[PDB]
Amino acid sequence: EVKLLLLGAGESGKSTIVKQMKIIHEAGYSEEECKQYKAVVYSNTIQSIIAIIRAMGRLKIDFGDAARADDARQLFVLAGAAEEGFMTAELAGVIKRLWKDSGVQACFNRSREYQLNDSAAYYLNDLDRIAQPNYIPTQQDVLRTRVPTTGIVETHFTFKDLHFKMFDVGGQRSERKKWIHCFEGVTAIIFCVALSDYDLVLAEDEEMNRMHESMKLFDSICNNKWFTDTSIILFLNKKDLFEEKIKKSPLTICYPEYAGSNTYEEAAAYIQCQFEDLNKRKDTKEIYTHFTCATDTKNVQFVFDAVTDVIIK
Ligand SMILES: Nc1nc2c(ncn2[C@@H]2O[C@H](COP(=O)(O)OP(=O)(O)O)[C@@H](O)[C@H]2O)c(=O)[nH]1
Ligand code: ALF
Ligand SMILES: [Mg+2]
């Protein structure tokens, strides 16, 4: 029996790693389970397009084509059905036209200025598929869903003859008071960090850089004497989103002293060193760092395979 505890700031990818265990070690999500997520996919989609439209008013961005104004009105009139797990052909057309608008896209490309689900584009770009009648969420669709974690979730699964008891909690500031309820008998901690968070601010505090928040938390956890004998695994997650973002958003926004280029390898390594340097006992405390894309089953399968070997050893 092994106890794994997933920690990290909000939206770092903790719950997604949990979902992967079911896909990798279990038979994946069944049709009935996938159908349960259909309303989540729809909710996520409607919420995302509305978030952008909301930002347009805040940032004073006009629609590319005046005709979209009518579609925007219809969006709210028809939104309700989507919230109930139903996607009419009419609603799909409205969302599709809005998503393709140049003004909506201009705002979309300025998302760091507000709050937007990372899976926004994933679903919006696949509207035709998810809008089909009798649509059934794929494994990737489930993995891409956004469901805030409040409280503690316990998941069980067997791997390499070991009985894993995996726990994940909420990462927002208001949820951290609950972390201590999971501190007993932890075999290993998997601390998740959203690499693509470097130019974002906390949803609970617009004055705090998301990455700096993750650093303070890791510093606290990694150096907690209570975990001296607990394996510390560091997941520098969302490497896929980071790879694209680093090309156009200065890392100096988060780390003023970064002197490297706008490239993945140099920046990724820099961030890794920033976190690993927080370890106050480098000689007696080992940090096992892995770069991950939590929604990529193949990546997680191999990374988790490596993580389990370390745990076994
Ligand atoms: N593109 C991408 N999306 C990710 C990745 N990890 C998580 N996500 C998405 O980001 C969102 C938040 O993850 P979630 O697991 O709910 O975060 P938690 O609050 O730490 O549990 C979900 O919509 C995920 O599907 C990743 O590596 N790449
Ligand atoms: F940390 Al979360 F949903 F934001 F589990
Ligand atoms: Mg969660």
UniProtKB/Swiss-Prot annotation:
<feature type="binding site">
    <location>
        <position position="15"/>
    </location>
    <ligand>
        <name>Mg(2+)</name>
    </ligand>
</feature>
<keyword id="KW-0132">Cell division</keyword>
<dbReference type="GO" id="GO:0000287">
    <property type="term" value="F:magnesium ion binding"/>
</dbReference>
<dbReference type="GO" id="GO:0005813">
    <property type="term" value="C:centrosome"/>
</dbReference>
<keyword id="KW-0472">Membrane</keyword>
<keyword id="KW-0813">Transport</keyword>
<keyword id="KW-0479">Metal-binding</keyword>
<dbReference type="GO" id="GO:0010854">
    <property type="term" value="F:adenylate cyclase regulator activity"/>
</dbReference>
<dbReference type="GO" id="GO:1904778">
    <property type="term" value="P:positive regulation of protein localization to cell cortex"/>
</dbReference>
<protein>
    <recommendedName>
        <fullName>Guanine nucleotide-binding protein G(i) subunit alpha-1</fullName>
        <ecNumber>3.6.5.-</ecNumber>
    </recommendedName>
</protein>
<dbReference type="GO" id="GO:0019003">
    <property type="term" value="F:GDP binding"/>
</dbReference>
<dbReference type="GO" id="GO:0072678">
    <property type="term" value="P:T cell migration"/>
</dbReference>
<dbReference type="GO" id="GO:0098794">
    <property type="term" value="C:postsynapse"/>
</dbReference>
<keyword id="KW-0547">Nucleotide-binding</keyword>
<keyword id="KW-0539">Nucleus</keyword>
<dbReference type="GO" id="GO:0050805">
    <property type="term" value="P:negative regulation of synaptic transmission"/>
</dbReference>
<dbReference type="GO" id="GO:0007193">
    <property type="term" value="P:adenylate cyclase-inhibiting G protein-coupled receptor signaling pathway"/>
</dbReference>
<dbReference type="InterPro" id="IPR011025">
    <property type="entry name" value="GproteinA_insert"/>
</dbReference>
<dbReference type="GO" id="GO:0007198">
    <property type="term" value="P:adenylate cyclase-inhibiting serotonin receptor signaling pathway"/>
</dbReference>
<keyword id="KW-0131">Cell cycle</keyword>
<dbReference type="GO" id="GO:0031683">
    <property type="term" value="F:G-protein beta/gamma-subunit complex binding"/>
</dbReference>
<dbReference type="GO" id="GO:0005634">
    <property type="term" value="C:nucleus"/>
</dbReference>
<dbReference type="Pfam" id="PF00503">
    <property type="entry name" value="G-alpha"/>
</dbReference>
<feature type="region of interest" description="G5 motif">
    <location>
        <begin position="292"/>
        <end position="297"/>
    </location>
</feature>
<keyword id="KW-0807">Transducer</keyword>
<dbReference type="GO" id="GO:0005829">
    <property type="term" value="C:cytosol"/>
</dbReference>
<keyword id="KW-0449">Lipoprotein</keyword>
<keyword id="KW-0963">Cytoplasm</keyword>
<feature type="region of interest" description="G1 motif">
    <location>
        <begin position="3"/>
        <end position="16"/>
    </location>
</feature>
<comment type="similarity">
    <text>Belongs to the G-alpha family. G(i/o/t/z) subfamily.</text>
</comment>
<dbReference type="GO" id="GO:0031749">
    <property type="term" value="F:D2 dopamine receptor binding"/>
</dbReference>
<dbReference type="GO" id="GO:0003924">
    <property type="term" value="F:GTPase activity"/>
</dbReference>
<keyword id="KW-0206">Cytoskeleton</keyword>
<dbReference type="GO" id="GO:0098978">
    <property type="term" value="C:glutamatergic synapse"/>
</dbReference>
<dbReference type="GO" id="GO:0032794">
    <property type="term" value="F:GTPase activating protein binding"/>
</dbReference>
<dbReference type="GO" id="GO:0032991">
    <property type="term" value="C:protein-containing complex"/>
</dbReference>
<feature type="region of interest" description="G3 motif">
    <location>
        <begin position="164"/>
        <end position="173"/>
    </location>
</feature>
<dbReference type="GO" id="GO:0034695">
    <property type="term" value="P:response to prostaglandin E"/>
</dbReference>
<dbReference type="GO" id="GO:0030496">
    <property type="term" value="C:midbody"/>
</dbReference>
<feature type="binding site">
    <location>
        <begin position="168"/>
        <end position="172"/>
    </location>
    <ligand>
        <name>GTP</name>
    </ligand>
</feature>
<comment type="subunit">
    <text>Heterotrimeric G proteins are composed of 3 units; alpha, beta and gamma. The alpha chain contains the guanine nucleotide binding site. Part of a spindle orientation complex at least composed of GNAI1, GPSM2 and NUMA1. Identified in complex with the beta subunit GNB1 and the gamma subunit GNG1. Identified in complex with the beta subunit GNB1 and the gamma subunit GNG2. Component of the TAS2R14-GNAI1 complex, consisting of TAS2R14, GNAI1, GNB1 and GNG2; within the complex interacts with TAS2R14; this complex plays a role in the perception of bitterness.</text>
</comment>
<dbReference type="GO" id="GO:0007188">
    <property type="term" value="P:adenylate cyclase-modulating G protein-coupled receptor signaling pathway"/>
</dbReference>
